[PDB]
Point group: D2
């Protein structure tokens, strides 16, 4: 009710859905209705697909450099409208302006810029077979792909998913989280203004698994779409360790997939470490995310808050020691918002629920260990295997330890800057591996292998 | 009957299954029971997994070049035993020895040889972030992976799947098709004899879907078409007929990539049919162990029954039966699963034999009037595995092939498939560097390591 | 006298050369003096080099993406000034405005845009050696490199050499051809306006081979790129060729830029049975070539680049006649009207040529096509290959097998089937460029302008045999 | 006189030179003549080239896997003949059998084995231009290339140069150092025995610069492969025992005859005394001796002229008042008098203007330089015309990382030394791994691109 009703984006313009049904997007800072948002119907999905199939033909028919300049123009518009997009994202997600202004759009534009540069670097192979025959391969666009948005980093993930897809000559239909639909629409406007052909990037808003499900079932849509340990070794700089543990747990109010929510500390260092974390947590600046001085906002929604409070209650019941936080923040204007205080449990155990399960809120679990191998064994003892980190002054030891840790992303004496080829939100590494940029593009193309026979054809018949 | 009971292969040796159950593998040339074969139980899966987990650590702890040398030793053994493995494959599958001796083991050994030489090249990336920080990557083995066998090219596909997986430092648990389980056990023996550590290549036999599911569900286990052939009016028709015949009757039509929808221009239909007929009439159907045979029985009696059902459907929908169309029962052939080479013509796009994959020796000939129409109809299908054109014109050959929607494309030939695709049959004698490297990457995972050497910054 | 004296370009501005010596650049269309141009001394080379050393440090300190942003701004400016730069190129080279306005700056900007986009992809390798030890690599700028220009595509080649050198983080000192020095200086201004730091692209003009020698001799110049690539490239027209397409290709392959192109197909092989029909088709096309004032956009064939080059070409034409080649058309200087004041040679075709003729054996770099008859395919290929040169080759045929088979048998690096003239980006030849670059060709080129630094780290114990 | 006169190896066989001239190769351990060796003439170079041209065509006509298998067969023969080849290399070079038996042939064969595996991984590209035109590229062999040998790692360098050249489908004409020509010929026989076609690897021996020049001049030779004062900076927080082990290894391995040797050793003033005592103790237990004895780890220099050159440099250091810490003379006791033995030598309190500091010596002579601060050390380290390798020793890896950024050498070591990159034809210890886009990249340098544009549409002409 703050903004006019949000409509579907198909064919370079907004169009009315065919379901007559809507949902609300709520500012988590105050419970205010930001906008009513239209639910795409199945008919509307078909409409987006046909728009996208035709649009993709125009896009693919352009030269590589033509596509590249168009995407580079979208980058420009993104950087000009950075503060405006951030403010909108802050309203929708609850994330502090200090985060959204310096991370979400910035890194998003950066990856779009990066991929735009690789568009003219997509080529195939030639393979000699014999004097009278050879093979050449062509990399062709998939056609139409679908992208499913995240609620923690809406615009960043929209950029992360659409950039390689569009760069590889595909159209994308994007469905943002129902929790956070606003910036995705803004993104689509920007693509259109930058010269991206109609239907190349359509946005379908929808709730529950339905709109996502229709994209999945549609035969013309070619493609679709942690409890990380932090081990503090005995020779760690404890100030660095506490800064890392705090950043790893409370940035974006703990709503990051790669968060280091299981913090292993050696028995001999437990007392000092707890005191240092305590000190850092007490000076966290929780507040209204529209205040530039806030560095810790409310959670993304009320139902998520209730879920986090459920986990915290689980931690108390299971006899984890509560070091700080542990409740909803309700004084002042906070009581109308979805605020959970930065929470830390210690003396945890591996069978505890707060330790086994992803919480996706500001809840750190501190676990005590006695020897190095034990800690690594326990760090690995999980279903997930997303990220891991070690803190130590001995790099030979760190080197040894990361060989033994079963995780795709490993941090040594830092945390949070995730590999550039991974569609996970938060800090992103300001540099990409050539092969990962090119391998990612390669995922959005299919290979055709053409064998040319120049000689006689042999038949056994 | 012919051979002793076949056991499970776990840990560098044969071991007893714990199901108390067996199935038979049958010689399709004469219907004799080749062997009773043990069924793996769920506990036998668990046993194979623990063996594999431990074997993989020994394997992965070796250098890439150490593994490569071992794999090359298996290559050397495979070439020595080529003829013997070929004859066994012919017993189990019915495929002519002339094929098995020159294709199945030769190309499988080739691909093992290829990955052994390529793997030590693989390195990681290093990426500076700023003066005090950098990230690097390394590719690591997945761990234990599962391989599911094909019935049409049992040992070739066993080699095609195990080669990159083993080269990349994984263990594989392999489950051959219940129709054709014999050669996969021989391959396991050969890996062991080559020096592959115990547990690195285990084989579990099983009937139906159960063993497959058990592998799929295991938490420690990490991981057809209706292809069109378009004959353009400027084609050499003799070459076209050669291509169409090979594309339909090699391995008795049991190839995934077969050109089972043959488009011919209306003005050339009559002459093309006569040329196909001349070639079909000299096909040498017979005992597949006889080196002079070039067309054997189908792989099994149930598969024969399914093909005969499709042939019945063709007649029912009034396709014109040009030749073949029945089981061959003369003399000793009536004891085998022999279906004559079969050609239907005057076919239409909506016919069941045209829409559905038969996996038997049934060619469908379709008439077109113009080139755009032939391309449109060729593309009008859910499948998209392979396609080919026959023409002598430079522009038309490339133009047409680029408009066809298939991943494997042939100009003026048929049948030799890219070496990076686990498709049985003839293989291209050449591999793209990127294709080879990419296949290897499917059997590895990337670990990214970021090191901060300076101060760490925090917003809190 | 048309333009003011042209100075050296060092440190983001024009500075005086230390000698008082100058040379002239001449408009080949009318013999007029376009400008006096200063000749650099050895001291100016030192000056330019010291400037380059320092500019390069500032340039290299930026990230690859920051460099690429700046180079993209240069691209934007080049597009803005396309017509102005083309007009100037036409004055200096005598090439038709229709060519310069659509080819020279357009493709040069294209290649700058390509390398700008490609360079931020470059990463290094990490190679584990054992549990406790690894080595990693990094690519680094060479430092200061030099480039030597060509007279036939001055600005296009200046862009071709400076684009990957600069993208990779180096500085370049460029010496354009003394025949055509004007546009290189304009390029230098444009790099500066775009934000390329002072000293990163310096231009030194000079006569003869001395400036080139001083650049080579300097110890702080890491690499020098000379190209200012001989060819006597064959075009084989097979009997099943479309003869109209073949005639079109042959004339484009011989008379574009008035025949002053490294890759030209100056030996045209025709089957004996088709010689007369093919000649008639070439002659028809040659007769409608619009030779004239290059400033007129309607002109498609200009004068040669200089009077001396014209005399050299006329010398070859005299040789062809003396050796009894049959003259099909042209064969003389064009002197009617104002053309007498310019360096104009008529489009010339000899036929009944023989492999031992001088015009067949030697590169002419002028508008002189040699037509040779053959009797079979193996003979054509053998004779096409029988030459010291191995630059380009082309075939015209409608048959799928013959097209690829003949090309596979031809010993040349640049090959064309049923076309001519669009050359690979990785080749520093002027003219039409292919609208697409192989990923590997691009990175390989970038790598020529970098060096590998290799760092091995030992985290564990060190072993000594002593 | 130990062996019969060595002839040229052209076209898979030994043939007589047409120069009428020979030179001698001398065993530096005892002064014995090993062999008279024929000098190739300009006419022999031509003969070798025409043999190479024809052989290369046979080699390139084979399938990629055929070439791969032949090169692998050569690897197996090299493993079989390791000890025999090592003994011969020891005779010719004076390098201890302990080195030659475990390093030279082992690592050479390792590199050939590596490249043999990549033969089938050579391929080109396809480049779309527009719907109606595309380009495909073919990687073809250059043809005939030349390799120039080095005297300090004869067989290893022969292997290092010939392996990618042959794997890429070229023929190579190889010219070993006149100081050490014997093993190159043995390698040539091994290639032939493995099935390499006649002419694909020819060997021409010669003295002076004649053969190398004639090869460079020859119009059918597409490429010639020819083969400083590297600093070792010991930071104040270095483990001095590690520092001393590295310094000693970096200076005295192969009797100091390695290209990448860290002959300028920078030590902080606060650590000079302790460091000197640690170097002294290690140097004193070096086992100088007959290189045929397995217990020897330090042999004579490669030749008598080289010894005299080294002794001249040692005289320069004394004359310029460098402080002699140890060694500093020819070892002449007993049998050693008949050989070319120079004691492991250490100068300290050196200065940057000293000849022994500024010039490369290629002998067992360490120059120790004192410094006061880290940036000064790094500056002085970079202040050399050369810029091959550098190393740092420190316990602070953050510091080491910063320092390698500032050091200008392209081969850098942190807390180690000696193992050079596996793409650089520099003898010695080698890194037991190669990054793909360098092995595969090196192969590319031995091929050229043929680019084929296919036009499927109308051809436009402005005329
Ligand atoms: K919301
Ligand atoms: K069977
Ligand atoms: K001029
Ligand atoms: K010697």
């Amino acid at each position: 009710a703050r903004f006019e009703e949000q409509k579907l984006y198909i064919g370079g313009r907004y169009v009315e859905a065919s379901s007559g049904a809507t949902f609300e997007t709520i500012n988590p800072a105050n419970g205010e209705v930001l906008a009513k948002v239209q639910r795409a119907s199945r008919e509307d999905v078909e409409r987006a697909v046909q728009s996208a199939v035709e649009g993709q033909k125009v896009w693919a028919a352009m030269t590589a450099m033509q596509r590249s300049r168009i995407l580079r123009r979208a980058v420009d518009i993104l950087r000009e409208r950075n503060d405006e997009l951030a403010a909108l994202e802050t309203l929708d997600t609850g994330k502090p302006l200090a985060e959204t202004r310096s991370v979400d759009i910035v890194t998003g534009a950066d990856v779009l810029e990066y991929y735009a540069g690789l568009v003219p670097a997509i080529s195939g192979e030639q393979i000699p077979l014999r004097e009278t025959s050879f093979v050449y391969t062509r990399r062709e666009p998939l056609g139409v792909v679908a992208g499913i948005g995240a609620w923690n980093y809406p615009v960043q993930i929209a950029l992360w998913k659409s950039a390689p897809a569009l760069a590889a000559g595909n159209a994308m239909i994007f469905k943002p989280s129902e929790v956070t639909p606003l910036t995705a629409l803004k993104l689509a406007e920007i693509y259109t203004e930058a010269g991206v052909p109609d239907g190349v990037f359509n946005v379908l808003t929808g709730s529950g698994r339905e709109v996502g499900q229709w994209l999945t079932e549609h035969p013309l849509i070619e493609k679709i779409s942690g409890k990380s340990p932090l081990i503090i070794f005995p020779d760690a700089d404890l100030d660095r360790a506490a800064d890392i543990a705090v950043m790893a747990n409370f940035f974006s109010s703990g709503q990051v997939c790669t968060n280091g929510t299981r913090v292993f500390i050696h028995r001999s260092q437990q007392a000092r470490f707890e005191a240092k974390v305590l000190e850092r947590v007490q000076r966290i600046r929780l507040g209204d995310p529209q205040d530039e001085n806030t560095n810790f906002g409310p959670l993304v929604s009320f139902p998520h808050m209730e879920s986090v409070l459920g986990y915290i209650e689980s931690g108390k019941a299971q006899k984890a020691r509560l070091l700080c936080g542990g409740e909803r923040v309700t004084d002042g204007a906070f009581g109308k918002g979805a605020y959970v205080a930065p929470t830390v449990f210690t003396d945890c155990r591996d069978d505890m629920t707060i330790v086994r399960e992803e919480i996706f809120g500001p809840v750190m679990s501190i676990l005590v260990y006695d020897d190095e191998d034990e800690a690594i064994r326990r760090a690995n003892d999980t279903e997930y295997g997303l990220a891991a980190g070690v803190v130590t002054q001995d790099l030979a030891r760190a080197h040894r330890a990361i060989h033994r840790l079963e995780a795709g992303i490993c941090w040594i004496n830092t945390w949070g800057e995730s590999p550039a080829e991974m569609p996970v939100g938060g800090y992103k590494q300001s540099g990409v591996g050539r092969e990962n940029g090119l391998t990612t593009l390669a995922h959005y193309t299919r290979i055709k292998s053409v064998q040319v026979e120049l000689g006689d054809y042999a038949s056994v018949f």
